[PDB]
Amino acid sequence: YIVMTQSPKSMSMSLGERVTLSCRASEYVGSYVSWYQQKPEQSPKLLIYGASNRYTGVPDRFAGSGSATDFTLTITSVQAEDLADYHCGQTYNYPTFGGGTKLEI
Amino acid sequence: EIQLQQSGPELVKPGTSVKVSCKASGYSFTDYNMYWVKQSHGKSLEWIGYIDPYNADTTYNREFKGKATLTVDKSSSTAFMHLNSLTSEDSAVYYCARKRNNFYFDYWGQGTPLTVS
Amino acid sequence: DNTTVFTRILDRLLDGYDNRLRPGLGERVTEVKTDIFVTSFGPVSDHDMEYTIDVFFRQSWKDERLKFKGPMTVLRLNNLMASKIWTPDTFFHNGKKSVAHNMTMPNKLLRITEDGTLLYTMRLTVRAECPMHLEDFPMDAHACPLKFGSYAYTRAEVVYEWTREPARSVVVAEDGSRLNQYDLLGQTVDSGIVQSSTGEYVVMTTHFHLKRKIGYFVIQTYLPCIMTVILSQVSFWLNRESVPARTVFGVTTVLTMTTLSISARNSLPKVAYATAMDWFIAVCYAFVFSALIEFATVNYFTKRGYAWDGKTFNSVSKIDRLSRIAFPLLFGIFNLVYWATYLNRE
Amino acid sequence: PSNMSLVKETVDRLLKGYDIRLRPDFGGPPVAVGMNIDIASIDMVSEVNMDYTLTMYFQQAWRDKRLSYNVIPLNLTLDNRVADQLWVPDTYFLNDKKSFVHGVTVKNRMIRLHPDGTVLYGLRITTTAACMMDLRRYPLDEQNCTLEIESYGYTTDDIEFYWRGDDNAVTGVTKIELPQFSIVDYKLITKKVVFSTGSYPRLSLSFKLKRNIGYFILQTYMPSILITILSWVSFWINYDASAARVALGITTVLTMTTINTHLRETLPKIPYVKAIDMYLMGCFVFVFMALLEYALVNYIFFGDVNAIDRWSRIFFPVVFSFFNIVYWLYYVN
Amino acid sequence: PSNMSLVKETVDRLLKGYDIRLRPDFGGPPVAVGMNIDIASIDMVSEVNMDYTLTMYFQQAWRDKRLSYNVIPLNLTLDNRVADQLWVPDTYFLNDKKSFVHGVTVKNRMIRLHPDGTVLYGLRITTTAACMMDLRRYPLDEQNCTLEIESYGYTTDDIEFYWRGDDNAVTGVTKIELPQFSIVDYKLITKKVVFSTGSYPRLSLSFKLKRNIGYFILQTYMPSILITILSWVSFWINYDASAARVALGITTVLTMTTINTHLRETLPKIPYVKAIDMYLMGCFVFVFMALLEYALVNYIFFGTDVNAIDRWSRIFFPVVFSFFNIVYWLYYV
Amino acid sequence: GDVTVILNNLLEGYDNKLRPDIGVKPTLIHTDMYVNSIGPVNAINMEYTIDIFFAQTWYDRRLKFNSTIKVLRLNSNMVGKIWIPDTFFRNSKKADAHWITTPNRMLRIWNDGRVLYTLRLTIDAECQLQLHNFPMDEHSCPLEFSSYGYPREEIVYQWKRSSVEVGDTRSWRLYQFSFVGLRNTTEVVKTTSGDYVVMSVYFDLSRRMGYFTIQTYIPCTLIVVLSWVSFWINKDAVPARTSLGITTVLTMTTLSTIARKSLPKVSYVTAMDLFVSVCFIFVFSALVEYGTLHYMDSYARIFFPTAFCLFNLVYWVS
Amino acid sequence: TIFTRILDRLLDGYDNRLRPGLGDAVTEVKTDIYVTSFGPVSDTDMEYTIDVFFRQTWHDERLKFDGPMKILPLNNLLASKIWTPDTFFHNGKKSVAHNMTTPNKLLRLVDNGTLLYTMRLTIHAECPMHLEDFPMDVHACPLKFGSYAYTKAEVIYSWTLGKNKSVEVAQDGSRLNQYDLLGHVVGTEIIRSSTGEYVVMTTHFHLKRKIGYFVIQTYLPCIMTVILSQVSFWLNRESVPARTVFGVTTVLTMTTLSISARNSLPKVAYATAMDWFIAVCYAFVFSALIEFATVNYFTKRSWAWEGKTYNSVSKVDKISRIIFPVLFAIFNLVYWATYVNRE
Ligand SMILES: *[C@@H]1O[C@H](CO)[C@@H](O[C@@H]2O[C@H](CO)[C@@H](O[C@@H]3O[C@H](CO[C@H]4O[C@H](CO)[C@@H](O)[C@H](O[C@H]5O[C@H](CO)[C@@H](O)[C@H](O)[C@@H]5O)[C@@H]4O)[C@@H](O)[C@H](O[C@H]4O[C@H](CO)[C@@H](O)[C@H](O)[C@@H]4O[C@H]4O[C@H](CO)[C@@H](O)[C@H](O)[C@@H]4O)[C@@H]3O)[C@H](O)[C@H]2NC(C)=O)[C@H](O)[C@H]1NC(C)=O
Ligand SMILES: CCCCCCCC(=O)OC[C@H](COP(=O)(O)O[C@@H]1[C@H](O)[C@H](O)[C@@H](OP(=O)(O)O)[C@H](OP(=O)(O)O)[C@H]1O)OC(=O)CCCCCCC
Ligand SMILES: *[C@@H]1O[C@H](CO)[C@@H](O)[C@H](O)[C@H]1NC(C)=O
Numbered sequence A: 001y002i003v004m005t006q007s008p009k010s011m012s013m014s015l016g017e018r019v020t021l022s023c024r025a026s027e028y029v030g031s032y033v034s035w036y037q038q039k040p041e042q043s044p045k046l047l048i049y050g051a052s053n054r055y056t057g058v059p060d061r062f063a064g065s066g067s068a069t070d071f072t073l074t075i076t077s078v079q080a081e082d083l084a085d086y087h088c089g090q091t092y093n094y095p096t097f098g099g100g101t102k103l104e105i
Numbered sequence B: 001e002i003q004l005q006q007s008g009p010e011l012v013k014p015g016t017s018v019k020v021s022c023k024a025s026g027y028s029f030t031d032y033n034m035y036w037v038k039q040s041h042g043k044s045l046e047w048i049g050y051i052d053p054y055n056a057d058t059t060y061n062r063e064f065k066g067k068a069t070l071t072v073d074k075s076s077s078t079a080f081m082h083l084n085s086l087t088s089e090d091s092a093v094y095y096c097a098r099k100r101n102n103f104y105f106d107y108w109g110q111g112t113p114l115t116v117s
Numbered sequence C: 001d002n003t004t005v006f007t008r009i010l011d012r013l014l015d016g017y018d019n020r021l022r023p024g025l026g027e028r029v030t031e032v033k034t035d036i037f038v039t040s041f042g043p044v045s046d047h048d049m050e051y052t053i054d055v056f057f058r059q060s061w062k063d064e065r066l067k068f069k070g071p072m073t074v075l076r077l078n079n080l081m082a083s084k085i086w087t088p089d090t091f092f093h094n095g096k097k098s099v100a101h102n103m104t105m106p107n108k109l110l111r112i113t114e115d116g117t118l119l120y121t122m123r124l125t126v127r128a129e130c131p132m133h134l135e136d137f138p139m140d141a142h143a144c145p146l147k148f149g150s151y152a153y154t155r156a157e158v159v160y161e162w163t164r165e166p167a168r169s170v171v172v173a174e175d176g177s178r179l180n181q182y183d184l185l186g187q188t189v190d191s192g193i194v195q196s197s198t199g200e201y202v203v204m205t206t207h208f209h210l211k212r213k214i215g216y217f218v219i220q221t222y223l224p225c226i227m228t229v230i231l232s233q234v235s236f237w238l239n240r241e242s243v244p245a246r247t248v249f250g251v252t253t254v255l256t257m258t259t260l261s262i263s264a265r266n267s268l269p270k271v272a273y274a275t276a277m278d279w280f281i282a283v284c285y286a287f288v289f290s291a292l293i294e295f296a297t298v299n300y301f302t303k304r305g306y307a308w309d310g311k312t313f314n315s316v317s318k319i320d321r322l323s324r325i326a327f328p329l330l331f332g333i334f335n336l337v338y339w340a341t342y343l344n345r346e
Numbered sequence D: 001p002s003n004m005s006l007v008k009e010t011v012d013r014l015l016k017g018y019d020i021r022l023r024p025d026f027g028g029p030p031v032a033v034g035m036n037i038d039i040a041s042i043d044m045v046s047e048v049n050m051d052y053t054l055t056m057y058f059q060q061a062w063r064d065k066r067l068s069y070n071v072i073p074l075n076l077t078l079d080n081r082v083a084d085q086l087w088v089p090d091t092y093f094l095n096d097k098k099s100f101v102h103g104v105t106v107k108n109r110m111i112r113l114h115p116d117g118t119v120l121y122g123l124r125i126t127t128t129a130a131c132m133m134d135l136r137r138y139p140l141d142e143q144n145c146t147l148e149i150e151s152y153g154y155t156t157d158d159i160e161f162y163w164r165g166d167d168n169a170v171t172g173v174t175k176i177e178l179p180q181f182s183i184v185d186y187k188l189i190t191k192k193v194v195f196s197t198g199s200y201p202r203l204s205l206s207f208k209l210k211r212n213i214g215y216f217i218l219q220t221y222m223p224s225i226l227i228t229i230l231s232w233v234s235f236w237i238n239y240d241a242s243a244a245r246v247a248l249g250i251t252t253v254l255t256m257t258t259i260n261t262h263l264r265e266t267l268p269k270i271p272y273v274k275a276i277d278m279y280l281m282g283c284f285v286f287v288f289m290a291l292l293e294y295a296l297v298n299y300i301f302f303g304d305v306n307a308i309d310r311w312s313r314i315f316f317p318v319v320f321s322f323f324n325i326v327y328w329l330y331y332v333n
Numbered sequence E: 001p002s003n004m005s006l007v008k009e010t011v012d013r014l015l016k017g018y019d020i021r022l023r024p025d026f027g028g029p030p031v032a033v034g035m036n037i038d039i040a041s042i043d044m045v046s047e048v049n050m051d052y053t054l055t056m057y058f059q060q061a062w063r064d065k066r067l068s069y070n071v072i073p074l075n076l077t078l079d080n081r082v083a084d085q086l087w088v089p090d091t092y093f094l095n096d097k098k099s100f101v102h103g104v105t106v107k108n109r110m111i112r113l114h115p116d117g118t119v120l121y122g123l124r125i126t127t128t129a130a131c132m133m134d135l136r137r138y139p140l141d142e143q144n145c146t147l148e149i150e151s152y153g154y155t156t157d158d159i160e161f162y163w164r165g166d167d168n169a170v171t172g173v174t175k176i177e178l179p180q181f182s183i184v185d186y187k188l189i190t191k192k193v194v195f196s197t198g199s200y201p202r203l204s205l206s207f208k209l210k211r212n213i214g215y216f217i218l219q220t221y222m223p224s225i226l227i228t229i230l231s232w233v234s235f236w237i238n239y240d241a242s243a244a245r246v247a248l249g250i251t252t253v254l255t256m257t258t259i260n261t262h263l264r265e266t267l268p269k270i271p272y273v274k275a276i277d278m279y280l281m282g283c284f285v286f287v288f289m290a291l292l293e294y295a296l297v298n299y300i301f302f303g304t305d306v307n308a309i310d311r312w313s314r315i316f317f318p319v320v321f322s323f324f325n326i327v328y329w330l331y332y333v
Numbered sequence F: 001g002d003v004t005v006i007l008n009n010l011l012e013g014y015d016n017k018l019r020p021d022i023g024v025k026p027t028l029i030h031t032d033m034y035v036n037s038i039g040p041v042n043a044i045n046m047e048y049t050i051d052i053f054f055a056q057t058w059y060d061r062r063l064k065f066n067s068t069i070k071v072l073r074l075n076s077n078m079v080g081k082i083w084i085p086d087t088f089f090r091n092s093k094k095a096d097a098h099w100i101t102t103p104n105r106m107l108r109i110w111n112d113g114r115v116l117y118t119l120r121l122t123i124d125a126e127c128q129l130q131l132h133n134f135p136m137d138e139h140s141c142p143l144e145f146s147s148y149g150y151p152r153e154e155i156v157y158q159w160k161r162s163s164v165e166v167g168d169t170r171s172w173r174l175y176q177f178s179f180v181g182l183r184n185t186t187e188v189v190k191t192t193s194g195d196y197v198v199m200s201v202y203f204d205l206s207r208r209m210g211y212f213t214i215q216t217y218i219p220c221t222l223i224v225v226l227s228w229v230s231f232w233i234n235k236d237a238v239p240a241r242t243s244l245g246i247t248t249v250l251t252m253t254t255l256s257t258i259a260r261k262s263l264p265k266v267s268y269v270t271a272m273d274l275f276v277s278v279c280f281i282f283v284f285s286a287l288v289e290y291g292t293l294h295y296m297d298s299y300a301r302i303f304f305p306t307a308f309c310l311f312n313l314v315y316w317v318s
Numbered sequence G: 001t002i003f004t005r006i007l008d009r010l011l012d013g014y015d016n017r018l019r020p021g022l023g024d025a026v027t028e029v030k031t032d033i034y035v036t037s038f039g040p041v042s043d044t045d046m047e048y049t050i051d052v053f054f055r056q057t058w059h060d061e062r063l064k065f066d067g068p069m070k071i072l073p074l075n076n077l078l079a080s081k082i083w084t085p086d087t088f089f090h091n092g093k094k095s096v097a098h099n100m101t102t103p104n105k106l107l108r109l110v111d112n113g114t115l116l117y118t119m120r121l122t123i124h125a126e127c128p129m130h131l132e133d134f135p136m137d138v139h140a141c142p143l144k145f146g147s148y149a150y151t152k153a154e155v156i157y158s159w160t161l162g163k164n165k166s167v168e169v170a171q172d173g174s175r176l177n178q179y180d181l182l183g184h185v186v187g188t189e190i191i192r193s194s195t196g197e198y199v200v201m202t203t204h205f206h207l208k209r210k211i212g213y214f215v216i217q218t219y220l221p222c223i224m225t226v227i228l229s230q231v232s233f234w235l236n237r238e239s240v241p242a243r244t245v246f247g248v249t250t251v252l253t254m255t256t257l258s259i260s261a262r263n264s265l266p267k268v269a270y271a272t273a274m275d276w277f278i279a280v281c282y283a284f285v286f287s288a289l290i291e292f293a294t295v296n297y298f299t300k301r302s303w304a305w306e307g308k309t310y311n312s313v314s315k316v317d318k319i320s321r322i323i324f325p326v327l328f329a330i331f332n333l334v335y336w337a338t339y340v341n342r343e
Helices: C004-014 C215-232 C243-266 C276-301 C318-343 D002-015 D080-085 D213-236 D242-266 D275-301 D305-332 E002-015 E080-085 E214-236 E242-266 E275-301 E305-332 F002-011 F076-081 F209-232 F238-261 F271-294 F297-317 G002-011 G076-081 G212-231 G240-264 G273-298 G315-341
Strands: A019-025 A033-038 A045-049 A062-067 A070-075 A085-090 B010-012 B017-023 B034-039 B046-052 B057-060 B068-073 B078-084 B093-098 B112-116 C030-040 C050-062 C074-077 C090-092 C108-113 C117-129 C141-145 C148-150 C158-162 C170-172 C182-195 C200-212 D031-046 D051-063 D091-093 D096-101 D109-113 D118-130 D142-151 D159-163 D181-195 D198-211 E031-036 E039-046 E051-063 E076-078 E091-093 E096-101 E109-113 E118-130 E142-151 E159-163 E181-195 E198-211 F027-042 F047-059 F071-074 F092-097 F105-110 F114-126 F138-141 F144-147 F155-164 F177-184 F187-191 F194-207 G027-037 G047-059 G071-074 G087-089 G092-097 G105-110 G114-126 G138-147 G155-159 G167-169 G179-193 G196-209
Touching (some): B034 B078, B046 B068, C004 C074, C050 C200, C148 C158, C215 C276, C215 D275, C243 D242, C276 C318, C276 E214, D080 D109, D091 D096, D118 D142, D159 D181, D213 D275, D213 D305, D275 D305, E002 E076, E080 E109, E091 E096, E118 E142, E159 E181, E159 E198, E214 E275, E242 E275, E275 E305, F002 F071, F027 F194, F076 F114, F138 F177, F144 F155, F209 F238, F209 F271, F209 G273, F238 F271, G002 G071, G076 G105, G114 G138, G138 G179, G155 G179, G155 G196, G167 G179, G212 G273, G212 G315, G273 G315
Parallel strands (some): C030 C158, C030 C170, F027 F155, G027 G155
Antiparallel strands (some): A033 A045, A033 A085, A062 A070, B034 B046, B093 B112, C108 C117, C141 C200, E109 E118, E142 E198, F047 F114, F071 F105, F105 F114, F138 F194, F177 F194, G047 G114, G138 G196, G179 G196
């Protein structure tokens, strides 16, 4: 299948600081890439779909973009509730999620 | 509103079998597929398989081909996953994920922890 | 009476059915799950920057007005029913001129499942524009697009979808390849939004990744070009005193390259930039022209008009002897640099 | 006139309540549709477009119990415009790129209802059918071009095909005169091809077209032979006549290049050497070596010589004959 | 489904009693029709046929009071088959030679009724419009091709045209890429042309198209220049080498003629000499004088001074050729 | 009007699907043809275009009317409303009816039920050309036609007295041929669907060699004459003799190729292909004559022109 | 709605299969043509294409109305619901009635009942060409049209604005690349056929071929080729290889010119005037080679001039270099004079 690789395994960004989360695909996935937020003991919640669009009822601080095989999720200013693990998936083929990326202060 | 409610916590021993269900509400079941996802403790999510509820067609991951079976009840909105020949490596939390489009998984299940020991 | 049961079902489906209004008009978006089974990837006309493709263009959408209950789950119907129902006004954005085959009858199947789902498939020969950038031609590869979407309905009215995983929703028949000078390496599919003068529209893009085969152009162009370069460099090994013979070599060889250079362009569009073959032709033109200029230089210093017999005789020109080894090395080094630069790109 | 009234009400009875949407035995077993073809001509075989133009009388017979009549003892042959009021198989030719039914003085079409219920449905169709020709042996090639008769919408559970008469179905093949080919064989096949939408019945009429080597011998091989034979006259010319032999050698070499380009211009831009190319390249190597023969004689006298010409006089014909024998045997057999 | 039933009643209400034969405000003031184009591509600008193919999303907007609805708050986009049940302007392109609406998968048309009564009527049209090209400066020519959009049956007393949005109406002209052209400017004009039947509203969409000279260096000028330069090599060859110089000279004269006729067979049969002909004529004179230069040298010796004509012609010919170019290029560039 | 009520009476209860006297007797049809212009004869595709006012006549008992009006001359609007014979042309590759400004059809009905039906057609009929005396070959190109569905028991055709009324031949598009004569026959051919009566009109077309003589033979003959010039040229001029020889040999290789461009790709030698080949032999012999001579000349000056004209007499007599 | 009330009454009880005044008189169809563009002329097919606003005016008492508008411009679709003359072009090879974006037709019912029915048509009509004087021909290409079914006793055609004002050609509307439209003359005749008598309207467009294109592509190459052959005379007579290349190249050049010339021309046996010019040019070119052959015949020493007897320039060469450019000169004068001076 297609493996998704989150380059920064962890971070230590401060509250109110911009943070970038990178996601790489072993091969083409088109715009079919999405980001989900996994708090501890909580199921994933979709934030970004299509590699650029934002799911309805989501804060505007979550901004994501990218091209083929290069996808980034950027948070302009993180809040207390924004500290959680992040998974980038691909649905151009049989779905395969990448390793989680977690944030610290 | 939409809400997927899975079975719940489970306790089992190697060699037995366990069935975990994924009820769906708020939308017609046959409209959209239902994907099943596994996540070990502190590990990346893994895709097991999905079932087309209308014609009950199924597609399985090669890693989980023959290890799990996907069945669906059209009358009562629920997707069922059955595991057999359980082992210690299969102790994880299992989610069921609706697919609204070919872009994203809209609504995810609560999550069903699995313990093998 | 045996078929009267199904006649009364079809009559009920179209009773009060307005085929001008889409499903969910004013209620929901009409999701059209599409699929393409390329029965055969037609020829690519680089001259017109277009390619032909034969497809079983499949479209599936839910139409709640066409729910039925009966002794069968899937009504298999001829095209005559299709014109009675609403179908998506799908068109091809880069389509130049396409044919909906209808011999013997309209090549369209229309299956209505009991839940209202439709499977509307048609056989088309789509002649689509492929904007071609022939910078590396003939060692070039093109991602010829096949864009399609609703002509009238905006994204708020109809949205298009792939019926399977996007990688698995465009299938090419195993023997379905009518390409002569191309190889269908594969396809990649994407879905985007195009902003137009009328509104926002969903566009389903399919990039058939074609790589040209240099087999034709190697025989047709490069070998005559190379053998013309080697025909010219035969003149170096002839005696300088043979002025008409070496002169005939240069003029004929240079004349040949002009014919070849004109000939090569005739198979291409009249692009205003030089292609990779143009530089090869230009260098080959330079190498034959230099081989005539070299002879003209030798003829300049040819102090005598009579060749060897059996009374000083003209010596072999140092320009010839250097040109004997220089021009096939320089010409060889050019080929290595030329071929390595273009062949090793991705 | 009384019989005309009886025939009128009978045909009116058949088409009254007739539903064109449902096939014969809808919801029942597949309707067995017979097929028989009478080929009128094969107009032209196009390598450039990879197709052949074929004109035929495509007759397909099937049984419709709704169209069975008993009162009159005769086979009605109705006006061809009635076919638009009757269910007909949605037969299509998968290979076709541009096909039509003739339309002068009326639509060239036939309907004839038999008392049993059998419908005999004939159309005069011209088809340009795709035939991907493996031209590696061209012009010594045998092209197995097919006409893939297949139902579009109806699966094997809804329709069935058969050649009405195993080989009595297809007629007129022997009377076809092709200017460039000769139909060695024709085969009739029934099949079931599976698509993602289901399994469908297939009839494949294959023609084992064999190229007429006579035409290409006149246009392609003989000029190459004559030019290659022409280039050999250089070996009897004295070495000092550089302008003559060089002009003679260059003209043959350049003309051979023009010939190679001209023939390939008439053919599609194929990526593989054909049998003609293997011959033209072989001849091209021979005329080119004839040029390099002098350039070798020149470069030993100026930069023994008589013997080099003497051997070239004999070997170039002989070793070119061996090229022909090896060439013809490999491709003819 | 309830909303769709409401939409069904509204659409059926409009077409009920709708006279397709009578234009909006028939017998009243002229109906103002709004054109706006979106050039999808300009294909095959043909000098031989004096026409260019132009694909476009030709949109016409007019107010049809009979098609005003107030119950539905959204803009009804109806199926393309409804256009046949509606009055549309009888718009035609006066210089259209061969045109069609695209018809795959359906008829490429748009009908979008707006609540106020506006009707946005879109068509995807490929049209081979006629453009009489003044090829005197060809290939250095800026061809001013137009699309003469006019109403056929309705005079200015019955219909009026207006670019909707003025110069914003036509879009996509910058994105168009032509292999041998560079669209430099496009202008929109609104006229009123008078025929014997009356005065009619005319919209002329003039594109000023400038030819890309770069292509013609590769295939036309540089081969001519190189051939012209190649002919000068005879000046460097000794006079006694009659066979060499004459062979060089005579080949140059012919190949220029073949190039001249090579372009003329790709070009229409027009009487006026073109700039390419002027350059080829100039190139023809130089090569033809280069041949006559030897013929002068030949008749001077065989009929020190003989060297002088060679030397002066050696440098004068490149000079006067360069002056010919500078005069040529300044005149045309 | 009086005519309108008559027309409504005729079509009332008229079953357009059923032929006149179906199951009672075969419907006799009379066909007469006025060849407006025989289009170009396309030898390459083995076809020719023809423009005709094809008129066919038959009696329909349902279309009899008694009135002071003796005939109803009508436009093409009536054609689709009444039973028309399903006549098709058996050798037509493609056939166009004319529709500008309106469908080019004519229909007339007499009191006795006689119907005269005429329509203008452009027919790209197929003519198998036998190419052995090309371009001195004569062809009898046919134009067959019969009912497509109705067999001999149902539809019968019979030539009228004015069977083929060829018009002014001067206006014809017959560029290469001269229309020599017209013949028409009638025969019954058996098909899988039954026996059908076929009417074939033979147009005997004789080719004019004047065009090809100046365009093909004279260039071939002159190039042969060019080869003869070599003999008078001094043998010592090796580049000149060879240049004259090679250029003429290679020129005929081009003339042989272009000679085939105007012909169908047939698998046999035509007379022109025979003519160019022997001319090829002459020039090749001329070049070979110098090749032997370099390693005699006076004899070639006589034998070559003597042999060439000797071939011409036997060749052109055939 | 009022204009719909009037417009539907005219079609009520209207039989479009019958002429106006059938059995009572002869329907007169007054015709005028506005040539929007005299399209190109195909010599090969003996046809020309002409884009036309074909206007027909006839009186129909069934289509008279009393309404607020004295003239009713209707949609083109109403033309199919009313009787129109079944006009067709006797020499029309192929024609197109444009439908982009709708049928390019206009239909106007004047209050008195007169109908104006105009169509935009492209007409490939036959133009039998007498190419004897090609490329300097004057061709009167006819445009014959008339009714197909209705005999002279039913439908007669006239010119609405008279003979000299019923065929108007737009001043700019000339797509003639190779011809000059000198003018047009219109006439009417009656043709007898096996089905009856019919009125035929003939419009002769007089076309003069522009010799300029052929001056450049064939005549000048022929003249320069003829000049090139006559270049041989000035060259040294011992230069046999150079002279022979001149002769063979020029003669073979003429063959290409002759074949290419006929390539544009149809496959007729008229033996056009260009053939005489090409043939005479061929004879001049061929005779130049024969002149070299006779020079070569008596060229004895075969050693070129040096500074050991030397050859003298042949009297044939001295006379050839005079007579050839004079005989071709006078041949041009007589040739050009005869063809240009013709009406
Ligand atoms: C597969 O698809 C193709 C295309 O999508 C279909 O082909 C088209 O089918 C339509 C519908 O049947 C045809 O329309 C008919 O056209 C008649 C005039 O033909 C001329 O104009 C058309 C313009 O459409 C041209 O295309 C034609 O040329 C082409 O076709 C002919 C064959 O028709 C070929 O021979 C040519 O080589 C071209 O390829 C012609 O130039 C027109 O008369 C006709 O309308 C009359 O009949 C209908 C019948 O329902 C009436 O409703 C209507 O009112 C007309 O009736 C009046 O006129 C007749 C004339 O005599 C009178 O008898 C009546 O009494 C009445 O007064 C119809 O509109 C179209 O020609 C055809 N071809 C095209 C578009 O190229 C195929 O059918 C379809 N199926 C298959 C199996 O292929
Ligand atoms: C564009 C291609 C050419 C551009 C090069 C342009 C450079 C250029 O113009 O060449 C000049 C020079 C001339 O040498 P050339 O070729 O003429 O050879 C000999 C030379 O001229 C002697 O001087 C002559 O003897 P002499 O003493 O006078 O009595 C002898 O005559 P002969 O005794 O036999 O009777 C000549 O054969 O060439 C070189 O030396 C090699 C240069 C490197 C050449 C390598 C270039 C690739
Ligand atoms: C028509 O009327 C005449 C009387 O003039 C009569 O002789 C004839 O038989 C009638 N024909 C019919 C009714 O068909």
